[PDB]
């Protein structure tokens, strides 16, 4: 499996890579369209990529942490693998984020809000310590962050 599938890694990684960078935004109806449309272009119909990247064990753990079971939540969850550009969450239902932090929790981290007395301060601390960081009420992109 390693032999014949790592030979299919290149296309495996193509597909996978593409999803994250582009379909981070779209809804599952639109996403699935492009999944199939590019999968068929590859000719690699099977080995659907959600099970590929994150194994059985991982999925259950994130359930365990109080992630929504929803597949979109699975999809979004795997987008946290993106680290090069910062991921931005729309989370009207806090749980997605809550999970994120919670899995984060017994690990170095911090949390603040857009409009906050301590905002600039905290930020500076976070960077020097390299404490991983989250922010709550991002009305838009802060110029400061560019």
């Amino acid at each position: 499996e390693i032999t014949e599938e790592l030979a299919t890694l290149p296309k495996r990684a193509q597909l996978a890579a593409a999803f994250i960078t582009y379909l981070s935004a779209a809804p599952e109806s639109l996403r699935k369209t492009c999944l199939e449309e590019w999968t068929k272009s590859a000719g690699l119909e099977k080995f659907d990529l959600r099970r590929f990247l994150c194994t059985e064990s991982e999925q259950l753990i994130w359930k365990s942490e109080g992630l929504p079971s929803d597949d979109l939540s699975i999809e979004n969850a795997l987008v946290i693998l993106q680290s090069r550009v910062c991921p931005f969450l729309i989370d009207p239902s806090s749980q997605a984020t809550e999970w994120l932090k919670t899995h984060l929790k017994d690990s170095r981290l911090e949390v603040i809000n857009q409009q906050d007395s301590n905002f600039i301060t905290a930020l500076e601390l976070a960077v020097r310590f390299g404490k991983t960081l989250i922010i709550q009420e991002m009305d838009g992109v802060e110029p400061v962050l560019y």
Binding site: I2, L6, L9, P10, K11, A13, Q14, A16, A17, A18, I20, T21, Y22, A25, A26, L30, C34, E37, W38, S41, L81, Q82, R84, V85
Partner: protein
């Protein structure tokens, strides 16, 4: 001031980019990325996104080469 229009990248050039990562079958791939990127312009896509696309392929393909290699090392044992 002289205005420069910098929008987009030339398709001919955008094929060359993936290939040039060799220096730092392949041909079907180098061509493929373009077409996927062309397909993303449907929603809207930028050269920065196109680039972002590449780095994750390189990086994560490189990662899993090694995560499979470490895997195979135990298999050998």
């Amino acid at each position: 001031c002289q205005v420069l229009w910098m929008e987009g990248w030339s398709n001919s050039s955008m094929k060359k980019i993936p290939e040039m990562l060799f220096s730092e079958v392949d041909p079907d791939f180098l061509k493929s990325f373009l077409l996927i990127h062309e397909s993303c312009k449907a929603y809207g896509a930028t050269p920065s996104q196109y680039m972002t696309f590449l780095h994750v392929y390189s990086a994560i393909s490189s990662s899993k080469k090694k995560e499979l290699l470490k895997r195979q090392s135990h298999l050998q044992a």
